[PDB]
Amino acid sequence: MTKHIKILVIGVGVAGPAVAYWLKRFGFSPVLIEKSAAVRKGGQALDIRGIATHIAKEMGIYDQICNMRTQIKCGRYVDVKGNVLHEEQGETFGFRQDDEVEILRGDLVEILMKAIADIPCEFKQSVIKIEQNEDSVTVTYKDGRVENYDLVIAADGIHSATRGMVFSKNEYQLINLGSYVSAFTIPNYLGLDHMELLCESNHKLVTLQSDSQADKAMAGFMFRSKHVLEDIRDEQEQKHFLHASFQNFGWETQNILNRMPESDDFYFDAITQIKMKSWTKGRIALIGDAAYCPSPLSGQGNNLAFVGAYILAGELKKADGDYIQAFTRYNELLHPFVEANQQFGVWVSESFLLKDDEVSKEIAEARSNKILAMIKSVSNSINLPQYE
Numbered sequence: 446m447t448k449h450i451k452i453l454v455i456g457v458g459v460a461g462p463a464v465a466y467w468l469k470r471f472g473f474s475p476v477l478i479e480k481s482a483a484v485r486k487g488g489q490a491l492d493i494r495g496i497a498t499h500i501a502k503e504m505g506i507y508d509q510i511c512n513m514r515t516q517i518k519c520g521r522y523v524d525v526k527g528n529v530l531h532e533e534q535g536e537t538f539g540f541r542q543d544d545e546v547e548i549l550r551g552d553l554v555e556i557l558m559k560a561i562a563d564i565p566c567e568f569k570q571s572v573i574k575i576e577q578n579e580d581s582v583t584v585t586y587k588d589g590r591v592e593n594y595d596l597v598i599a600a601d602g603i604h605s606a607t608r609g610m611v612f613s614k615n616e617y618q619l620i621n622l623g624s625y626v627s628a629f630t631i632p633n634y635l636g637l638d639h640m641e642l643l644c645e646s647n648h649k650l651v652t653l654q655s656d657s658q659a660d661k662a663m664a665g666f667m668f669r670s671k672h673v674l675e676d677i678r679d680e681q682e683q684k685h686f687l688h689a690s691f692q693n694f695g696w697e698t699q700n701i702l703n704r705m706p707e708s709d710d711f712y713f714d715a716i717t718q719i720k721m722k723s724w725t726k727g728r729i730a731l732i733g734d735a736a737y738c739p740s741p742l743s744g745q746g747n748n749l750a751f752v753g754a755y756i757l758a759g760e761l762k763k764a765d766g767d768y769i770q771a772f773t774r775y776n777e778l779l780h781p782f783v784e785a786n787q788q789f790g791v792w793v794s795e796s797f798l799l800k801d802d803e804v805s806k807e808i809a810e811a812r813s814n815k816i817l818a819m820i821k822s823v824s825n826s827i828n829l830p831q832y833e
């Protein structure tokens with residue numbers, strides 16, 4: 446029966462634990478692995494918007510998410526001299542409305558894992574080799590131990606090792622949006638209280654906020670550049686590039702960058718999307734950022750993780766575990782919605798900033814209203830199957 450189908454789910458992010466939840470509810474027996482020792486606390490703030498709030502409510506986690514939600518009371522668009530151009534209440538500022546909610550990644554993953562407490566999960570574990578034939582997926586773990594599974598679902602993130610192990614370069618594109626993102630935590634030296642400030646120039650944006658930790662602030666940097674690093678994973682090159690890019694910005698960036706050396710969560714990356722004609726090969730499926738990452742400029746990644754998890758599990762349910770049928774349906778039903786959400790990110794990468802002009806109240810307000818409306822349009826733009 447479907448209960449006896451062996452399914453390996455790789456990574457304890459959003460998509461992995463969510464697809465594990467739905468597979469179990471739908472009569473399958475998934476197991477999870479995670480390379481890290483434990484769920485990473487804190488991290489980036491994730492949005493649940495549009496159709497994804499329905500899925501969260503059905504999973505029984507929506508109230509728990511709302512209990513752990515981000516608490517920004519107001520955001521402000523400020524000029525480099527600290528004048529307020531435009532102020533919005535926190536949810537509106539974040540382009541959320543209605544039942545939509547924002548939660549730090551680590552707090553969401555904790556809730557997801559509490560909802561699957563019955564599902565076996567092994568941390569400090571990773572797959573170093575995958576081979577498949579018509580009957581089985583043979584997995585080799587890091588220590589050489591081998592196990593066979595009927596299916597493997599890889600939720601291992603935008604940099605996914607499984608994608609590289611399974612697919613060739615002809616089978617996916619890494620779409621570079623021409624921009625970089627960086628974030629790090631510093632002492633809250635301004636004494637912000639549940640508030641975010643956002644300052645921009647033609648090609649760059651800087652945010653500073655304090656929310657759940659009164660003595661900490663999170664800094665963020667997004668900027669368009671055609672520069673390529675010698676080694677994009679070299680952290681000292683990243684910090685020199687960030688510093689050089691922002692040396693002339695003004696506002697709080699000297700105060701922020703002067704505290705960068707002592708921050709312990711530093712994050713830097715190119716803004717990239719994953720475009721695949723097929724997320725699946727044989728008995729192996731990619732899901733979440735590994736398959737379809739829309740990039741942070743979209744603000745939809747978490748939504749795509751939730752929707753992908755629901756659809757892949759439900760199509761396996763409706764196929765009674767026939768993965769050839771279900772994987773085809775997974776690809777066909779979800780690609781347009783993924784493409785819409787990725788193209789929203791592309792749009793942000795191209796039109797959010799004012800190329801030739803200085804921001805004003807009128808521009809920030811009209812832009813904010815437009816994004817709110819476009820995101821509501823794109824985030825509701827799938828007719829979600831009903832699998833029960």
Ligand SMILES: Cc1cc2nc3c(=O)[nH]c(=O)nc-3n(C[C@H](O)[C@H](O)[C@H](O)COP(=O)(O)OP(=O)(O)OC[C@H]3O[C@@H](n4cnc5c(N)ncnc54)[C@H](O)[C@@H]3O)c2cc1C
Nearest residue numbers: 456457458459460480492571601602733734741744746747
């Ligand atoms: C700067 C930034 C800002 C963002 N802002 C937003 C936003 O405003 N709204 C929004 O909705 N989304 C946002 N996101 C996106 C959100 O973080 C992702 O879309 C979401 O986390 C997708 O989850 P996932 O489960 O696909 O992957 P992830 O959450 O990345 O989890 C993948 C997991 O797999 C593990 N793993 C990796 N490799 C292996 C391996 N080889 N073996 C085993 N385990 C492995 C990882 O440690 C990790 O726990 C942002 C992301 C970033 C980086």
